[PDB]
mmCIF file of N, CA and C in Angstrom:
data_model
loop_
_atom_site.group_PDB
_atom_site.id
_atom_site.type_symbol
_atom_site.label_atom_id
_atom_site.label_comp_id
_atom_site.label_asym_id
_atom_site.label_seq_id
_atom_site.Cartn_x
_atom_site.Cartn_y
_atom_site.Cartn_z
ATOM 1 N N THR A 1 65.872 113.017 217.556
ATOM 2 C CA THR A 1 66.198 111.600 216.900
ATOM 3 C C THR A 1 65.883 111.892 216.466
ATOM 4 N N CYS A 2 65.453 110.326 216.479
ATOM 5 C CA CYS A 2 65.172 110.418 214.393
ATOM 6 C C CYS A 2 64.406 108.777 214.768
ATOM 7 N N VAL A 3 63.903 108.390 215.097
ATOM 8 C CA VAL A 3 63.768 106.821 214.526
ATOM 9 C C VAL A 3 62.366 106.041 213.238
ATOM 10 N N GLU A 4 63.085 105.645 212.587
ATOM 11 C CA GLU A 4 62.198 104.735 211.384
ATOM 12 C C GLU A 4 61.468 103.561 211.404
ATOM 13 N N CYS A 5 60.387 103.128 210.657
ATOM 14 C CA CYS A 5 59.990 102.533 210.887
ATOM 15 C C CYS A 5 59.297 102.358 209.812
ATOM 16 N N UNK A 6 59.357 101.468 209.015
ATOM 17 C CA UNK A 6 58.543 100.923 206.961
ATOM 18 C C UNK A 6 58.517 102.444 207.133
ATOM 19 N N UNK A 7 59.303 102.788 206.401
ATOM 20 C CA UNK A 7 58.648 104.265 205.924
ATOM 21 C C UNK A 7 58.597 105.155 206.608
ATOM 22 N N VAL A 8 58.262 105.735 208.370
ATOM 23 C CA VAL A 8 56.896 105.862 209.150
ATOM 24 C C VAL A 8 59.478 106.901 209.655
ATOM 25 N N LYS A 9 58.707 108.231 209.932
ATOM 26 C CA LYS A 9 60.240 108.972 210.356
ATOM 27 C C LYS A 9 60.009 109.137 211.074
ATOM 28 N N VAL A 10 59.658 108.758 212.981
ATOM 29 C CA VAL A 10 59.685 110.058 213.921
ATOM 30 C C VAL A 10 60.652 111.090 215.260
ATOM 31 N N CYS A 11 60.438 111.932 214.380
ATOM 32 C CA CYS A 11 61.367 112.483 214.796
ATOM 33 C C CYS A 11 61.591 113.708 216.097
ATOM 34 N N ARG A 12 61.651 112.982 217.405
ATOM 35 C CA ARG A 12 61.223 113.496 218.823
ATOM 36 C C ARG A 12 62.821 114.039 219.177
ATOM 37 N N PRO A 13 62.344 114.912 220.224
ATOM 38 C CA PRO A 13 63.360 115.244 221.492
ATOM 39 C C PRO A 13 64.825 113.842 221.355
ATOM 40 N N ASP A 14 63.650 113.320 222.580
ATOM 41 C CA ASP A 14 63.767 112.243 223.208
ATOM 42 C C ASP A 14 64.165 111.570 222.182
ATOM 43 N N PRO A 15 64.716 109.786 222.217
ATOM 44 C CA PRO A 15 64.366 108.781 221.208
ATOM 45 C C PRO A 15 63.259 108.152 221.980
ATOM 46 N N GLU A 16 62.793 108.172 223.336
ATOM 47 C CA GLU A 16 61.682 106.951 223.836
ATOM 48 C C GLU A 16 60.615 107.748 223.127
ATOM 49 N N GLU A 17 60.251 109.054 223.359
ATOM 50 C CA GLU A 17 59.092 109.726 223.059
ATOM 51 C C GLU A 17 58.465 109.115 221.650
ATOM 52 N N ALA A 18 59.790 109.499 221.493
ATOM 53 C CA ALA A 18 60.022 108.615 219.278
ATOM 54 C C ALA A 18 59.449 108.255 218.982
ATOM 55 N N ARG A 19 59.998 106.884 220.568
ATOM 56 C CA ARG A 19 59.620 104.853 219.613
ATOM 57 C C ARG A 19 58.020 105.378 219.978
ATOM 58 N N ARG A 20 58.381 106.372 221.851
ATOM 59 C CA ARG A 20 56.534 105.945 222.721
ATOM 60 C C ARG A 20 55.299 105.995 221.365
ATOM 61 N N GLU A 21 55.638 106.884 220.264
ATOM 62 C CA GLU A 21 54.304 107.022 219.081
ATOM 63 C C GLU A 21 54.810 105.690 217.652
ATOM 64 N N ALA A 22 55.838 106.425 217.904
ATOM 65 C CA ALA A 22 56.378 105.091 216.734
ATOM 66 C C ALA A 22 55.700 103.652 216.502
ATOM 67 N N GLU A 23 56.183 103.199 217.488
ATOM 68 C CA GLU A 23 56.263 101.545 218.048
ATOM 69 C C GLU A 23 55.124 101.287 218.153
ATOM 70 N N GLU A 24 53.851 102.387 218.201
ATOM 71 C CA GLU A 24 52.627 102.175 219.342
ATOM 72 C C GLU A 24 51.789 102.380 216.952
ATOM 73 N N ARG A 25 52.475 102.931 216.087
ATOM 74 C CA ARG A 25 51.884 102.979 215.110
ATOM 75 C C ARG A 25 53.003 101.181 214.153
ATOM 76 N N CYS A 26 53.996 100.929 214.683
ATOM 77 C CA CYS A 26 55.542 99.607 213.882
ATOM 78 C C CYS A 26 55.289 99.050 215.303
#
């Protein structure tokens, strides 16, 4: 699952895990 925030593309198996680092940046 890839969550994208401000040009940052976080692709991790779990959306929650992805968000956990993604929203930590974004």
